[PDB]
From a paper:
One of the most highly conserved sub-families are the SNX proteins with regulator of G-protein signalling (RGS) domains or SNX-RGS proteins. Other well-characterised family members include Mdm1 from Saccharomyces cerevisiae and Snazarus (Snz) from Drosophila melanogaster. These proteins have relatively low sequence similarity across homologues and across species but share a conserved architecture with an N-terminal hydrophobic membrane anchor, and a central RGS domain and PX domain (except for SNX19 orthologues which lack the RGS domain). The N-terminal membrane anchor mediates localisation to the endoplasmic reticulum (ER), and the proteins typically localise to sites of new lipid droplet synthesis and can enhance membrane tethering of the ER to other membrane compartments via their PX domains including the vacuole in yeast, the plasma membrane in Drosophila and endolysosomal compartments in mammalian cells. The precise function of the SNX-RGS proteins is still unclear although their mutation or depletion has significant impacts on cellular physiology, particularly with respect to lipid homeostasis and endolysosomal function.
Here we have also solved the structure of the human SNX25 RGS domain by X-ray crystallography in two crystal forms. The wildtype sequence of the RGS domain crystallises with a non-native disulfide bond formed by Cys526 between adjacent monomers in the crystal lattice which distorts the orientation of the helix α5. Here we have solved the crystal structure of the human SNX25 RGS domain, revealing a typical α-helical RGS fold. The structure predicted by AlphaFold2 is remarkably close to the SNX25 crystal structure, with an overall root-mean-squared-deviation (RMSD) of 0.8 Å over 107 Cα atoms. The predicted structures of the human SNX13 and SNX14 RGS domains from the AlphaFold2 database are generally similar to the experimental SNX25 RGS domain structure as expected, but with some notable differences. Overall, these comparisons confirm that the AlphaFold2 predictions of selected SNX-RGS domains are accurate models comparable to their known experimental structures, including the RGS domain of SNX25 for which no detailed structural information was available prior to this study.
Residue numbers in the entry: 447 to 569
Write the structure that this text describes.
């Protein structure tokens, strides 16, 4: 009956892993992995926060482009991502990635063969 809400899809490890498998089919699993990394940051102890923020950059923002802003301005990027500013930036990107996952990818996941596995067959 009632459609699972995308908020609950990402809150439940069993649901979210199935949605991640669907994103892998689209070769866009880095979108949900980045969302999961920022969310893990929101619920992490502060002794791990700066190293996690650094691993987020090293896992999702180090794609080497031909016009290499990442290499030419490495120090300059890190300094404008230093403290609460960097955490606030990663939060805003997570918010934008969330809307893209919700509006562009979640509707086709509901009609995929994976949404069935999230439904309880009543006995």
């Amino acid at each position: 009956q009632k459609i699972l809400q995308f908020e609950d899809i990402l809150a439940n490890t069993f649901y979210r892993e199935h949605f991640g498998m669907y994103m892998e089919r689209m070769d866009k699993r880095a979108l949900i992995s980045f969302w999961e990394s920022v969310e893990h940051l929101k619920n992490a102890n502060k002794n791990e926060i700066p190293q996690l923020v650094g691993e987020i950059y090293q896992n999702f923002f180090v794609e080497s482009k031909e016009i290499s802003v990442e290499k030419s301005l490495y120090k300059e990027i890190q300094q404008c991502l230093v403290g609460n500013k960097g955490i606030e930036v990663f939060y805003k990107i997570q918010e934008d990635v969330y809307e893209t996952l919700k509006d562009r990818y979640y509707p086709s996941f509901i009609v995929s063969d994976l949404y069935e596995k999230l439904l309880i067959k009543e006995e």
